[PDB]
Amino acid sequence: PDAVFGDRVRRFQEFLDTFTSYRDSVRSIQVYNSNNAANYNDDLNILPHRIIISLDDLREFDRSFWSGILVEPAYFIPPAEKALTDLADSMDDVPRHPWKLSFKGSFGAHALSPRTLTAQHLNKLVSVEGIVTKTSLVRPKLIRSVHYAAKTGRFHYRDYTDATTTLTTRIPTPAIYPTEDTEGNKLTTEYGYSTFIDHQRITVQEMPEMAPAGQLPRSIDVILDDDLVDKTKPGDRVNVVGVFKSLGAGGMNQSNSTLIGFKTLILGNTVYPLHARSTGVAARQMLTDFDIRNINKLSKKKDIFDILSQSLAPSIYGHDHIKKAILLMLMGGVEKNLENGSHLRGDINILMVGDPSTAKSQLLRFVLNTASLAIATTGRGSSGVGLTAAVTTDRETGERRLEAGAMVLADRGVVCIDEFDKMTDVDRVAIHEVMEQQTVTIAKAGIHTTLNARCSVIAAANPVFGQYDVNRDPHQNIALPDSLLSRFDLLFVVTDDINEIRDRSISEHVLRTHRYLPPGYLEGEPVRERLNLSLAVGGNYNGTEIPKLVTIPFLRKYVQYAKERVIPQLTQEAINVIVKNYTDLRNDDNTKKSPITARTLETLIRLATAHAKVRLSKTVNKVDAKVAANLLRFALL
Amino acid sequence: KSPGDNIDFQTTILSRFDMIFIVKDDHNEERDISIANHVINIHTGNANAMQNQQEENGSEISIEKMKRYITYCRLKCAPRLSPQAAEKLSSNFVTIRKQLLINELESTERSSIPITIRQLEAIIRITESLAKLELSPIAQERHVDEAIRLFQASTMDAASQDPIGGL
Numbered sequence: 001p002d003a004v005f006g007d008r009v010r011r012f013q014e015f016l017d018t019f020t021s022y023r024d025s026v027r028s029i030q031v032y033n034s035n036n037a038a039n040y041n042d043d044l045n046i047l048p049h050r051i052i053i054s055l056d057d058l059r060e061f062d063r064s065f066w067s068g069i070l071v072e073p074a075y076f077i078p079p080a081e082k083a084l085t086d087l088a089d090s091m092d093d094v095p096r097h098p099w100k101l102s103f104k105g106s107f108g109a110h111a112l113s114p115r116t117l118t119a120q121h122l123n124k125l126v127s128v129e130g131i132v133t134k135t136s137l138v139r140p141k142l143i144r145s146v147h148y149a150a151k152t153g154r155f156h157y158r159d160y161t162d163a164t165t166t167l168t169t170r171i172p173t174p175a176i177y178p179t180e181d182t183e184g185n186k187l188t189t190e191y192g193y194s195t196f197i198d199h200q201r202i203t204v205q206e207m208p209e210m211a212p213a214g215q216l217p218r219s220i221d222v223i224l225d226d227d228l229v230d231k232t233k234p235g236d237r238v239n240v241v242g243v244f245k246s247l248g249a250g251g252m253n254q255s256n257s258t259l260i261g262f263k264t265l266i267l268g269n270t271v272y273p274l275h276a277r278s279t280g281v282a283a284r285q286m287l288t289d290f291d292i293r294n295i296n297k298l299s300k301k302k303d304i305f306d307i308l309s310q311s312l313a314p315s316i317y318g319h320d321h322i323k324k325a326i327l328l329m330l331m332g333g334v335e336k337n338l339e340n341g342s343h344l345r346g347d348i349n350i351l352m353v354g355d356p357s358t359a360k361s362q363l364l365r366f367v368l369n370t371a372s373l374a375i376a377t378t379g380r381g382s383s384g385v386g387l388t389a390a391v392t393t394d395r396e397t398g399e400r401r402l403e404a405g406a407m408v409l410a411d412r413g414v415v416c417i418d419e420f421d422k423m424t425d426v427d428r429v430a431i432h433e434v435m436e437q438q439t440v441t442i443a444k445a446g447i448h449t450t451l452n453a454r455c456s457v458i459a460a461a462n463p464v465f466g467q468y469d470v471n472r473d474p475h476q477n478i479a480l481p482d483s484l485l486s487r488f489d490l491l492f493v494v495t496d497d498i499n500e501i502r503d504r505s506i507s508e509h510v511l512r513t514h515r516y517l518p519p520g521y522l523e524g525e526p527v528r529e530r531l532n533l534s535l536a537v538g539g540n541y542n543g544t545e546i547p548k549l550v551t552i553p554f555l556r557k558y559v560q561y562a563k564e565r566v567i568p569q570l571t572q573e574a575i576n577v578i579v580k581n582y583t584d585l586r587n588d589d590n591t592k593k594s595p596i597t598a599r600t601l602e603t604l605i606r607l608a609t610a611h612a613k614v615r616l617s618k619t620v621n622k623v624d625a626k627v628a629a630n631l632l633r634f635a636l637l
Numbered sequence: 638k639s640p641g642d643n644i645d646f647q648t649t650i651l652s653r654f655d656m657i658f659i660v661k662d663d664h665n666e667e668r669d670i671s672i673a674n675h676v677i678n679i680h681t682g683n684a685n686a687m688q689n690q691q692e693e694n695g696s697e698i699s700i701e702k703m704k705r706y707i708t709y710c711r712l713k714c715a716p717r718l719s720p721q722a723a724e725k726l727s728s729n730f731v732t733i734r735k736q737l738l739i740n741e742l743e744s745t746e747r748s749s750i751p752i753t754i755r756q757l758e759a760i761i762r763i764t765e766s767l768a769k770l771e772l773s774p775i776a777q778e779r780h781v782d783e784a785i786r787l788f789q790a791s792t793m794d795a796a797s798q799d800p801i802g803g804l
């Protein structure tokens with residue numbers, strides 16, 4: 001027993017007594033585990049034993065103890081974990097694994113990058129943001145081995161420890177695997193009674209957005225334990241909070257005799273997957289009760305479709321039906337999976353073609369910025385391997401392994417393709433499968449797989465003559481295969497027609513947009529750019545808290561709520577409308593930009609379902625079918 | 638030939654650029670004499686003495702002083718258009734596209750060089766740059782007039798070289 005250890009245990013006990021939020025978070029974890037255990041006993045998931053701790057509240061309580069954790073975590077974190085374990089055991093007396101700690105809040109000078117990490121930050125609690133490049137296999141590590149002696153019929157055990165579990169170093173005592181007991185009898189290993197804890201190591205290098213553009217990047221190794229394994233995949237943007245530790249002796253032994261130096265790695269306490277622009281992490285946000293109440297209030301209005309669409313990109317004049325189509329695509333529709341394994345599409349694909357400088361790439365960049373899992377792609381920059389998938393070779397296992405392309409990483413998301421007309425033929429054939437069958441089939445040397453690629457696709461194309469011609473037929477203007485046009489749900493032809501009143505309105509809108517100042521900024525001060533990183537949980541400027549038009553952060557809340565909560569179903573009143581419209585459109589005589597196939601009926605169904613998702617309605621109504629038909633009729637005519 | 642006929646790329650790329658310049662070989666004796674004389678002054682060293690004397694005079698600055706001034710202007714100032722200067726921009730931007738509209742209706746053929754909303758934002762950017770020249774937090778009408786003068790000297794004479802955009 002150590003006196004300073006006990007004093008720090010008492011100090012963290014006082015800190016936990018002051019802030020009841022950690023105490024009843026522990027209580028909530030315990031009652032959830034007990035309820036699941038009782039449900040398993042009578043008739044599942046288990047929560048890990050760790051608590052998120054705010055460093056700011058600790059700094060408010062005890063600055064000395066906060067600076068002790070930040071500067072010397074090996075002496076301060078284990079007393080805090082011991083105090084948390086004692087408190088949890090005190091509340092567990094009425095209803096075994098020790099409790100862990102996770103740290104959040106401002107770190108100050110300890111918020112670093114893999115390039116910025118030096119050895120002055122060793123043995124310190126650091127927060128490191130970067131991109132995951134390598135993710136090793138989750139391997140079980142033996143902690144306690146249980147053996148059976150048949151001559152005496154007795155169960156023995158042995159505990160094993162290493163340097164990566166404990167923060168403070170101890171004497172390395174290598175206990176071998178016991179195969180005979182003290183008296184020499186044979187011991188048989190009892191698998192299933194031995195304890196194995198999952199272990200992973202990941203490689204985090206600095207993100208290419210703030211990496212220097214010229215030279216090589218720097219990377220670090222992060223060790224993760226049972227409750228932190230499989231929280232990441234390669235390509236994620238992460239913030240890892242952990243102790244920057246050094247292990248072993250840097251060749252100073254006689255047996256070791258090389259200059260690798262002291263090996264340096266982070267004992268990860270916390271892993272946050274952050275959402276960045278055009279990455280594989282989906283943007284998720286906490287929905288408070290006030291926000292849900294506001295969403296429900298907007299659900300009862302009759303003009304809600306005209307409010308959410310016009311509030312998408314208020315800096316772009318016109319293109320109202322394009323805004324409606326983008327909103328209905330963001331709703332996503334409903335996919336159908338039948339009992340025979342068949343899959344029916346839910347996602348909506350939008351193609352826009354027309355004259356240059358018609359706010360196409362700006363709309364693409366908006367959908368990239370406002371969707372949860374939008375990934376941006378250009379025409380000639382990406383190829384067949386970069387779009388679907390590719391095959392590389394693992395260094396450790398020695399076998400081939402898969403790299404997920406742009407379209408696979410945007411599963412349950414949006415693929416924002418710019419300059420669609422310049423794509424290669426092999427790309428077109430590859431994406432024929434993805435836009436309809438919603439999968440990617442890989443048949444390479446030794447690898448035959450099927451990857452889910454359920455995506456919405458926005459494409460921006462350009463006519464082969466540079467400008468759209470009214471008198472010419474649209475098949476020559478678009479100059480795309482009929483199959484590709486059949487894959488896209490909606491096709492919008494945008495024409496930069498000149499009119500004096502309309503051009504006056506465009507000019508006034510552009511100048512009014514160009515007379516904007518951010519809040520808290522001076523007249524001459526340039527607006528600063530901060531790179532947008534968001535944690536993933538689980539022309540009027542003054543649009544704030546649903547006054548006339550929905551602000552963008554609340555619009556994302558509305559979209560997220562409508563995606564997870566409501567799943568509408570069809571009813572015969574909408575069915576008669578969509579059947580009449582589809583069978584009329586197949587037998588219309590007027591020339592259409594898009595050819596009419598059996599897919600158009602499913603586009604009608606998807607648009608009706610998306611409009612029902614806008615209304616937060618459990619069913620699809622007749623007005624939803626009318627809106628779905630009238631939106632498609634504009635895109636067709 | 639048309640200006641878009643001379644380029645070995647798409648005519649939309651010209652619309653991607655904010656300002657275009659057509660550089661002409663006028664072939665005048667009084668001009669090439671002056672150009673040749675200037676090159677001779679470069680080669681003898683009289684131009685070096687003239688530029689040093691002009692820098693000491695105060696009507697030219699050094700390249701490193703220009704570099705630091707550019708950095709200071711970009712890091713310190715970012716002007717905003719005055720409300721009174723927006724009406725001139727909108728009116729003189731819509732008159733140009735009205736002229737191109739009537740030219741296209743008369744010619745019944747699309748012009749090889751276009752002017753779009755991107756060009757309006759280009760003229761706005763030129764005005765804000767001329768306002769950023771004197772570390773001015775606000776842009777006045779005198780910047781708008783000069784920005785329009787540069788646009789006329791750069792993109793509109795190129796459009797007039799296009800005989801669809803002329804007439």
Ligand SMILES: Nc1ncnc2c1ncn2[C@@H]1O[C@H](COP(=O)(O)OP(=O)(O)O)[C@@H](O)[C@H]1O
Pocket residue numbers: 315316317318355356357358359360361362363510754755758
């Ligand atoms: N309808 C519009 N409303 C506002 N701005 C527009 C509109 N159309 C074009 N612009 C402006 O024109 C510029 C050119 O970009 P963009 O139009 O996206 O190119 P493209 O149409 O080739 O994708 C953009 O900065 C955008 O602000």
Ligand SMILES: [Mg+2]
Pocket residue numbers: 357360361
């Ligand atoms: Mg574009």
